[PDB]
Amino acid sequence: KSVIDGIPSLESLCKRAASIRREALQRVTGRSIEGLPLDGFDYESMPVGYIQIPVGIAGPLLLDGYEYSVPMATTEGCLVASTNRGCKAMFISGGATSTVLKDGMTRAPVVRFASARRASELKFFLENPENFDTLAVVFNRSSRFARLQSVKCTIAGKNAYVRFCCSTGDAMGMNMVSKGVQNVLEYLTDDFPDMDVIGISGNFCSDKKPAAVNWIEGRGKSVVCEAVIRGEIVNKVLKTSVAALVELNMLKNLAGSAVAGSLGGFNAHASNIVSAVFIATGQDPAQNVESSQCITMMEAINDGKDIHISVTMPSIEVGTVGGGTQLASQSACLNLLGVKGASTESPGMNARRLATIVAGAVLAGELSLMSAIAAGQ
Amino acid sequence: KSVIDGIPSLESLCKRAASIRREALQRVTGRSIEGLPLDGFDYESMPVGYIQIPVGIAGPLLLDGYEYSVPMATTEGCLVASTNRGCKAMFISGGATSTVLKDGMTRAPVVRFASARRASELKFFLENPENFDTLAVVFNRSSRFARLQSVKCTIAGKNAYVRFCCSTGDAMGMNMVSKGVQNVLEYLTDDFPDMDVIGISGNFCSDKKPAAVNWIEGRGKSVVCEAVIRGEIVNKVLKTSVAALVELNMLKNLAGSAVAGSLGGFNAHASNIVSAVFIATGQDPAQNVESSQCITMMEAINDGKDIHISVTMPSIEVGTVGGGTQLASQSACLNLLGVKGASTESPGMNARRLATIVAGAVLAGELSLMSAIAAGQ
Amino acid sequence: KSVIDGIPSLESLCKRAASIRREALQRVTGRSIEGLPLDGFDYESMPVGYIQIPVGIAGPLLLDGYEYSVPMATTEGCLVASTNRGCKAMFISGGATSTVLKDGMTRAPVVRFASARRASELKFFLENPENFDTLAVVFNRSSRFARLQSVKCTIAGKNAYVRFCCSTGDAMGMNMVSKGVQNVLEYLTDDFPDMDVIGISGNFCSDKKPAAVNWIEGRGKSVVCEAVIRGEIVNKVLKTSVAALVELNMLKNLAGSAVAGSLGGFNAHASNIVSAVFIATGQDPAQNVESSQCITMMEAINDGKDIHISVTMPSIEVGTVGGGTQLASQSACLNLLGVKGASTESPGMNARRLATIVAGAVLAGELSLMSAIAAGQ
Amino acid sequence: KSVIDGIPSLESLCKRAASIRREALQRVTGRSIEGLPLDGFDYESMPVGYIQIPVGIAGPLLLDGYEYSVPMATTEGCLVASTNRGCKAMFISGGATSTVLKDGMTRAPVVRFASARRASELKFFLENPENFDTLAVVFNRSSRFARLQSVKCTIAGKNAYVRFCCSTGDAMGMNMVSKGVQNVLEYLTDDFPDMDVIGISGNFCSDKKPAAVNWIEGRGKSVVCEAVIRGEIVNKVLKTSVAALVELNMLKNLAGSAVAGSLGGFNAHASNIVSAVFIATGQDPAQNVESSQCITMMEAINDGKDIHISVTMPSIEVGTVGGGTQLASQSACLNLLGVKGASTESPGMNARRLATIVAGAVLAGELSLMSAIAAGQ
């Protein structure tokens, strides 16, 4: 208790230190943090406690022939219940099919020269296919798992925003892409000694921000997920018509988002589902900003009898290794999905499958909410 | 254990039911969820468990003359440590000043008519100042706390996207604005019996999506937060110059975001800080998407000797009543900030103060990360 | 010819001076400008000649009960021919109906203070309804025709972007809104002597740039134009189906523009028609950038038998007085439309009608090109 | 005159026909088009006349070591005069340096399949480097000058937006890229007989619309143009300081455009200069919408003594062959610049040089207007 004393004049004595700081904070603050638990968490895995978010289960989600019980960390029973209704409707409709369209994490440092002419010489150097193997060798010293895929260099005046894209195995891969970029920036001091490195991120990555570069180019896992709901199931189960769902999608998710001046927001509530699964599975909750990017498409097929439904999500940023993924509670949620840790089969397959599951759960959420709106007409 | 049996052929027997579903899920799934705790949570407050996120403390944050210990729910000690460094630098610089520029939650139903001419008659009706008091009376039956502020009606063909804005006291207010919109849509069946209500949300709100309507118009709390760091402190404490910080802000947060095609992403990592405080204080983590919207400005003042730093955040969506805010752990975090529950002084003052604290913590995070980048040159 | 001499050692001796500069330019340049005419133009109305663009006629365009022969200044006979086909199809379909949703030109100076707190005091002052009549009196000294409608002040750090909106009679009104803004900025030196005026335009207007402020808020004339094409005419004349046109609109103008990351570009070729009419009628060709902003909507009506078609154009910037509108050739084109000069009925009615004609011609162009694409399937 | 009769009962008897239609139009319309000339134009090169726009000269513009007299087709003497002031300031500052960063015209058809899985198979086929030479051979039958550079396929649900990029020699190249796309779509019916071609343009090109695809990826000529103005010239000639110009650029062209929600509009008035040169040189005036895309950068160099100024313009769409470029008056304006017709040296060099001249004239306009604003403080 004398430790709490010196309040007078943290960075520690983990749990013992955790306990000391709590009393110091309540004493100095004058505020009770009574309902914030200390006990029940391994702090070895400036902590003062931990918050609790309840995990609900949505499913079974039938995806590429497999059944998933989707963990959703949220306050609202109504989000789990609604996603669950979407899972049931797709389960009797042959389930969902996912396709991974692209897989690579990006980092875009800003560097500058004395002229745009000189900056353009870095661009032409880096984008010359003959130089790729050398840049990749330098980059890939980053890690066992780092594989450079591309370098795109955008010039703005005497500045270059140099977008590196690489695979990172089952890691989300922000630390890996960064080490790789540092290798290439050090290697470049030979042919480019006039280069000033302004920052490891020039906001062209673009990390934890909505950006057209990510919508156009993708970032992390670019995924499309689709299902066909038969007319008879749209009528009997979803209590609407093919026509009403197609029209609502066009008026709400396409025209409405257009009128609102949306960037990547051509969907009903992808953000709700992405956030809940992200927190359950120990992802970075700040990457929900670009991971929720989605265009929902609903089209009449088979002479207007059935509906083709899809979500296209260009920038799902997930990993199954590192960060919050290796805490006990979040690890258990990845294990439920069968994507805990690195892939046995081939590096990155677990993080890819996680991305397809997010997209499948988003498709279920879109079908359920859009059906409820349409049925309520 | 026979309950787990009928697996054969949730919506319950709260904790007792919670326990039953867990065994049913592990048995049916074939997957261990061993490290997901059941015990230690009041389920009365389809749950199968809860995840734990550790809470670190950033501060003291000196804001409008008061000192705050900012709870940050995150995996990374480095985010708390960095935000803490920003708090110290501002604490010796006279602290931060916040200004609330606007406060109101929005909902934008999509309705349609047989013609754009007819849709325009709803627009001119709703936007006619003589009709406001009648619309407000109908709207404000929503709640003791519901106060209609404005109605803006955007026409797209024969469709109207009708944006309602109202104060909601200390509630985030999505349910309140929605009840109010339903009152007005029912009242309108008199003068507009030809009106088809397509949906309570036409994506023009715009909720949990990045949209220019929210950047231009605001949503929830629109806040600016500012501080002045003296040259001598920029040199000795932040290990950089006024010139280097102003140039990095222009090249990274302004030019870089512009080159990336950003919408509201004119900042270094507002999303990181917003997400951590949002989860600590039981906010909706999906509203991080628009609540992270921020332009960071850094300008040389006093003949280039000092630096004026600010964040302008048009759409911070927070409440201190309802949702996750009334769970034990998240309640304790609001109580630390002194903004638990409804305002004693005047309804909405707690949710406003919470918004200013988020903006202050974001300013600290921006100063710390931008200083570290600049100092690393 | 000695004048051309002093080539030796812009701003003049109008036609006489025009002729002198031409020889000086060919002599000094070494380049023949033989095919650029000098004769045939009244230079009294550093000119070296004039270019010629041929004027084709599209119509009759049946709009709000009147018939128009639409002058289109363009190189391509195919653009006039296609727009003409659209006019015919609408002419047998009952013609088009326009609605003016808003009419006001904007200017947004950037001003700054020592703090965001102080900048916010200008915001609250300017947006306080009690101050409006005083601001309007100061503003409206601008002109006989200047009528202030609104002032919106956006704060970014210690800077204010102050958006003034006013009616300007039949003038496009950029010079009028500017004089009015100067009056208000001078009047404000009393209560705001600390205010630094950084520029008369802070790019928030936003003039001759694509900006979400103009898409969301409008600028100049905000217009919707609509028509109904009967199934039998879609089949027999346009050689397609209602279903094919609705699907093409959703896949091309909505989904396609969304995938492209469009701002206000939810249309097939509004820009082609706007540019041609703008140049014919002596408008500012640089304002084509925001005047082409358009969402094209095509919806099945009457149990899928007929198609409702519309264009919604939030920022058509036109005048019938001042600028190029009072040159001989462009005056003749306005006179063809019956909108030459100021309105006899009421100030602004000619410029409003011109805006509805542009929207009608755009609707015709959209119907023709979209029908040709659909029919080509 | 009996021809005008049958008014009774567009497509012709060129000038003879031109004359007939004029009387028919005045008779039927009741409107005089007296000041629209018929005589003075070769109609062999549904015309009813031609408009006249006066051509002013800006320069000399010193660009990559050469001097240019820049033809500007505009109503306002003040735009030519202002651009002229910018040319003088750069002329005594060592002139401007341009760099072409990319050169290729794009077309993006929308095609669809029964599934996103099947659509993804077209993507992987088209983006497989092993298939490139076959696709290029099929594409390049388009023309002597058509050279396929890249194919990027974006999937949205069961739809593919397939972006083809090719060089087109000195032609703007919209017709060439289109023939090439038709070759590839016909060749694909072998391996993809299930493919439905919805349209030759799916708005992902993106032609005559502001789109992030063009800002991020470029379209036509991507150009950067730069100059250094010495402190002594900023003081004595431009009547401002290096500090004031850098601050105005950051507050107006960067922060202001950001606050406005601009896409590619990070500049003062690029649109004004682009439109004037486009019309003078017979370019497509509708392509001003994307050709005006520009970020203006102004940075203090040499210990704050001098200013580095640049424009980066990702999508300048110009040709010197075909369209309006081969009319007499517009041909004379290209000839003044020394870029009339196809390149003798190497195909495309004339259209590239034209693009660098536009960028140089835009830089001059930006320097002049920004200096005038700064000097007026």
Numbering used by the authors:
A (entry chain AAA), B (entry chain AAA), C (entry chain AAA), D (entry chain AAA): 177 to 182, 184 to 186, 189 to 191, 193, 196 to 227, 235 to 566
What does the paper say about this structure?
HMGR (3-hydroxy-3-methylglutaryl-coenzyme A reductase) is the rate limiting enzyme of the eukaryotic mevalonate pathway successfully targeted by statins to treat hypercholesterolemia in humans.
To develop plant-specific statins and mitigate off-target effects, we solved the crystal structure of the core domain of apo AtHMG1 and in complex with pitavastatin to resolutions of 1.9 and 2.1 Å, respectively, in space groupI 41 2 2. Closer inspection of the statin-binding pocket revealed two substitutions in AtHMG1 with respect to HsHMGCR located at the hydrophobic CoA binding region of the active site pocket, specifically, Ile562/Leu857 and Ile389/Val683 in AtHMG1/HsHMGCR respectively. Importantly, the arrangement of the AtHMG1 Lβ2-Lα1 loop results in Glu265 being unable to form a hydrogen bond with the O5-hydroxyl group of the HMG moiety of statins or the equivalent thioester oxygen of HMG-CoA, as it is shifted 2.5 Å away, creating a wider pocket. Glu265 is not in a favourable position to hydrogen bond to either the substrate thioester oxygen or the adjacent Asp473, which based on HsHMGCR in silico simulations (HsHMGCR Glu559 and Asp767) might be expected to hydrogen bond and stabilise the mevaldyl-CoA intermediate.
